Amino acid sequence: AGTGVVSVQFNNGSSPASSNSIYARFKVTNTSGSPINLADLKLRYYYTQDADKPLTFWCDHAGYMSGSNYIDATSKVTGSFKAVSPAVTNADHYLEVALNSDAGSLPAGGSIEIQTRFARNDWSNFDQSNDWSYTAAGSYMDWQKISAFVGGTLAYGSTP
């Protein structure tokens, strides 16, 4: 039921099922026929918490081409962790990646790369094997288990 305003690829550097870091990297492509305000772009990654501990979010790198100038939006990305009510199998929470009001505009046919990760404050191990959006992907690939919303409506992927 995705609008196809954007296409999205994913990879997590093929992280181990048991890991103290969850990686989530997206290559988002504007396939609608007009600029898109990065402010309107949300990305979601569904998982099972396994333990209720404080998490820390990191955006390692984010950037895109605007005309012929390369724009580094790394510092403009934010991450949020919210519950999935009601909880479904392999999904009781989800990471929501967003960008600040002035991130910029993604030009028609343009691409933005967003590399993120998160971990518990105590670095204990997660069990990614019971995470809905999890799959060991070492290179970008079309993975339909993550979602992208534009302006509040699903544009790519699915939700549990």
Annotated binding site for Zn(2+): 93
Minimum distance of Zn ion from residue 133's CB (angstroms): 16
C-alpha 45/C-alpha 37 separation (Å) is 21
Pattern 59-98, binding to Zn ion, x per CB under 5 A?
Answer: ------------------------x---------------
Minimum distance of Zn ion from residue 84's CB (angstroms): 9
Residue closer to Ca ion (CB basis): 37 or 130: 130
30 neighbors 83 (Cβ within 8 angstroms)? no
83 binds, among Ca ion, Zn ion, none (CB under 5 to 8 A by kind): Zn ion
Residue closer to Ca ion (CB basis): 44 or 76: 44
Dihedral sign of CA atoms 117, 121, 123, 129 in order: negative
Query: How many amino acids of this chain bind Zn ion (CB under 5 A)?
Result: 1
40 binds, among Zn ion, Ca ion, none (CB under 5 to 8 A by kind): none
State yes or no: residue 51 binds Zn ion (CB under 5 A): no
Residue closer to Zn ion (CB basis): 17 or 83: 83
Minimum distance of Ca ion from residue 98's CB (angstroms): 23
C-alpha 6/C-alpha 155 separation (Å) is 6
Q: Where are the alpha helices (DSSP H) in the chain?
A: none
The alpha carbon of 107 is separated from its chain's Cα centroid by a whole number of angstroms, namely 19
Residue 31's alpha-carbon distances to 18, 64, 108, 147, in angstroms, are: 35, 15, 6, 15
